Enzyme design. Structure first.
Site, PDB file in Angstrom:
ATOM      1  N   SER A  42       0.793  -1.228   0.000  1.00 60.39           N
ATOM      2  CA  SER A  42       0.000   0.000   0.000  1.00 60.39           C
ATOM      3  C   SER A  42       0.827   1.282   0.000  1.00 60.39           C
ATOM      4  CB  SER A  42      -0.978   0.018   1.170  1.00 60.39           C
ATOM      5  OG  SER A  42      -2.012  -0.925   0.984  1.00 60.39           O
ATOM      6  N   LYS A 206       2.729   6.556   5.220  1.00 63.82           N
ATOM      7  CA  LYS A 206       1.918   5.595   4.487  1.00 63.82           C
ATOM      8  C   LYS A 206       2.522   4.222   4.695  1.00 63.82           C
ATOM      9  CE  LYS A 206      -1.326   3.990   2.173  1.00 63.82           C
ATOM     10  NZ  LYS A 206      -1.133   2.983   3.237  1.00 63.82           N
ATOM     11  N   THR A 207       1.717   3.294   5.190  1.00 63.29           N
ATOM     12  CA  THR A 207       2.158   1.935   5.446  1.00 63.29           C
ATOM     13  C   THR A 207       1.894   1.034   4.242  1.00 63.29           C
ATOM     14  OG1 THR A 207       0.044   1.438   6.478  1.00 63.29           O
ATOM     15  CG2 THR A 207       1.818   2.156   7.924  1.00 63.29           C
ATOM     16  N   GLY A 208       2.470  -0.154   4.298  1.00 64.39           N
ATOM     17  CA  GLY A 208       2.127  -1.217   3.371  1.00 64.39           C
ATOM     18  C   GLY A 208       2.257  -2.543   4.082  1.00 64.39           C
TER      19      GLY A 208
END
Length: 263
Positions: A42, A206-208
């Site tokens: 993501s 922003k994570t993933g």
């Protein structure tokens, strides 16, 4: 030094850890596997929102345009869009959901508005990122198969691209602030970089998350009245559990803060 500390942390994770730091006060930089490819998961959604904002700046898109959809369009893990099948959501609301919740349907709907993964990749090429590539849609882009270059970035390329987008002249001032505002409002990162950063820093991130024990986080960090520092962290092929993978990212933040004084 930091590189040996990250190697120790990497070994304890059982996987492959990539870190890039880019300090906009001076241009000082650091990489640990900075030029290796990692699955974005993501984290690509920060770039997706930027590409949408670029179209808005050009008059080709409208943040208030309403997009409608059905349960037929819902991807797994769509915590915002699942609530709005009746009424739809605006482009701006979808950007906020994609960034702050990693909402997968929001991301697919925005990809459709842009022209798909190839259009996002073309946007990245047009701003000087020759490395990052999006190839698939949600949820397949999270497969994170070892050796697969699809849907990957490098830590250094992601940090450089974030710098260009948030602080360069690609986006209008209003679009830059809107992107920053969305990142600052992220809800998915409390156990990752934020957990290792000083309390008085303002943070957007922003994570993933993906298969093969993939846990990522990319951040723009403003210490008090200071020019920002960009930090991009990718972990994949990890063999520890989900909480432990989060703790790896938090520890990267702590190590970076403690080591960044070194020239």
């Amino acid at each position: 030094a930091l590189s040996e500390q990250l190697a120790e942390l990497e070994k304890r994770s059982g996987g492959r850890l990539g870190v890039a730091v880019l300090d906009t006060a001076t241009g000082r930089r650091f990489g640990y596997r900075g030029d290796e490819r990692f699955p974005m998961c993501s984290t690509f959604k920060a770039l997706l929102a930027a590409a949408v904002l670029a179209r808005v700046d050009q008059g080709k898109e409208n943040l208030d345009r309403r997009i409608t959809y059905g349960k037929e369009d819902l991807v797994d893990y769509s915590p915002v869009t699942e609530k709005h099948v009746g009424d739809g959501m605006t482009v701006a609301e979808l950007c906020e959901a994609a960034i702050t919740y990693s909402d997968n349907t929001a991301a697919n709907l925005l990809l459709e508005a842009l022209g798909g993964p190839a259009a996002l990749t073309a946007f990245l090429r047009s701003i000087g990122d020759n490395v990052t590539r999006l190839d698939r849609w949600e949820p397949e882009l999270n497969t994170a198969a070892p050796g697969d270059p699809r849907d990957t970035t490098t830590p250094a390329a992601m940090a450089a691209t974030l710098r260009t987008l948030l602080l360069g002249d690609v986006l209008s001032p209003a679009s830059r602030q809107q992107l920053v505002d969305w990142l600052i409002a992220n809800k998915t990162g409390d156990k990752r970089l934020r957990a290792g950063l000083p309390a008085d820093d303002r943070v957007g991130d922003k994570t993933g998350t993906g298969e093969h024990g993939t846990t990522n986080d990319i951040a723009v960090i403003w210490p008090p009245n200071r020019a920002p520092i960009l930090v991009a962290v990718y972990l994949t092929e990890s063999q520890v559990d989900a909480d432990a993978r989060d703790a790896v990212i938090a520890e990267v933040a702590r190590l970076v803060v403690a080591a960044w004084h070194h020239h």
